[PDB]
């Protein structure tokens, strides 16, 4: 039990890593998780950054236990010192805050790397930045209800719940492997958010089938749906159209394949198509990453067709 330990900046249980430090995949290992965690805690707390300014931006040897041990001791002592500074007159750091996008990206990486330990069993990454663009574009409020349809190991739900104020966030997933992993991710996410002292809106990861009778009314009372439908066959896409027809006004759907055409002009031969009750717009892709679509339930376009004929 050689070990490295990192103290929480808010008194939660320390993160404990074994030595030699594990490798996650060809591009991520525990050594760098540690270094990046330290650096993010220095951004969280400016005094900490000052206290180890002469240590945080030097490229330690991640293969020497002593070099890594020196980094963690330097950090752990600085934390002890900050916790004393807060005991005095100096006020602590706020505990109600949401994590910045950078920090959240780092947390979700370590949560994933700690939860999904054999990513071969998920055979049968860059989703974070795409989801982040969408979070910036699709404004959400404490009124809204969020769902990720086919939520996987849950990371997109975790991202949105950490970023927005919605009253609730849901993921729904039918396969047992990803649902198993989702339970761990949930566990880890709560651990590390506590560890960093950061807030999240409420969320739930469920096992279930979003095309079932139970989910019909749930979809109808959902105001924000994300669905990566790029590989759904036409049966499933037709099933979802049926579900979305019952959505309240203003309800939003963001997808990769559109559920109604952009050009849709309403006429007598198509007046029952879903295109009659929703605006559709193509959303800008991220330079580095391809088409995404925003559907907003607007029944007034049906109204304007009936008002027009009535003239
Ligand atoms: C590809 C989709 C469908 N899904 C993605 C899992 C991670 N979530 C995710 O990528 N969300 C997301 C990401 C980006 C976007 C945008 C690009 C911004 C539009 C939108 C959504 C895969 C999971 O859906 C599950 N799924 C598929 C059908 C099925 C079912 N009817 N009920 C239950 N779960 C089911 C399937 O078992 C997979 O675990």
UniProtKB/Swiss-Prot annotation:
Please report the organism this UniProt entry assigns to the protein.
Homo sapiens (Human)
Q: What else is known?
A: In contrast to other lysine histone methyltransferases, it does not contain a SET domain, suggesting the existence of another mechanism for methylation of lysine residues of histones.
DOT1 domain sequence ranges: 13-310
Q: Which residues bind S-adenosyl-L-methionine?
A: 146-155, 173, 209-210
**Which protein is depicted?**
Histone-lysine N-methyltransferase, H3 lysine-79 specific
Assembly information from the UniProt record:
Interacts with MLLT10.
Q: What is its main location?
A: nucleus
* GO biological process assignments: DNA damage checkpoint signaling; DNA repair; gene expression; methylation; positive regulation of transcription by RNA polymerase II; regulation of receptor signaling pathway via JAK-STAT; regulation of transcription regulatory region DNA binding; subtelomeric heterochromatin formation
Q: Which residues of the full protein are shown?
A: 4 to 331 of 1537
């Amino acid at each position: 039990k050689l070990e490295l330990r990192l103290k929480s900046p808010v008194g939660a249980e320390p993160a404990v890593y074994p030595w030699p430090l594990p490798v996650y995949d060809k591009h991520h290992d525990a050594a760098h998780e540690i270094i990046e965690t330290i650096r993010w805690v220095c951004e969280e707390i400016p005094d900490l950054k000052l206290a180890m300014e002469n240590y945080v931006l030097i490229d330690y040897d991640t293969k020497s236990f002593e070099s890594m041990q020196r980094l963690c001791d330097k950090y752990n002592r600085a934390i002890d010192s900050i916790h004393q500074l807060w005991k005095g007159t100096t006020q602590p750091m706020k505990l109600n805050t949401r994590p910045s996008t950078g920090l959240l990206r780092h947390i979700l990486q370590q949560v994933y790397n700690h939860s999904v330990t054999d990513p071969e069993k998920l055979n049968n990454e860059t989703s974070f930045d795409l989801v982040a663009q969408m979070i910036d574009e699709i404004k959400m409020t404490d009124d809204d209800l969020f769902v990720d349809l086919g939520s996987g190991v849950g990371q997109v739900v975790l991202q949105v719940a950490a970023a927005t104020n919605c009253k609730h966030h849901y993921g729904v997933e039918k396969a047992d492997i990803p649902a198993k992993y989702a339970e761990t991710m949930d566990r880890e996410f709560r651990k590390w958010m506590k560890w960093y002292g950061k807030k999240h809106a409420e969320y739930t990861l469920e096992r279930g089938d979003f095309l079932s009778e139970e989910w019909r009314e749930r979809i109808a009372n959902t105001s924000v749906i994300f669905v990566n439908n790029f590989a759904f066959g036409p049966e499933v896409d037709h099933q979802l159209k049926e579900r979305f027809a019952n959505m309240k006004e203003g309800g939003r759907i963001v997808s990769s394949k559109p559920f109604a055409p952009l050009n849709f002009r309403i006429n007598s031969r198509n007046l029952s198509d879903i295109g009659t009750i929703m605006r559709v717009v193509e959303l800008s892709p991220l330079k580095g990453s391809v088409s995404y679509y925003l559907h907003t339930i607007d029944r007034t376009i049906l109204e304007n067709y009936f008002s027009s004929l009535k003239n």
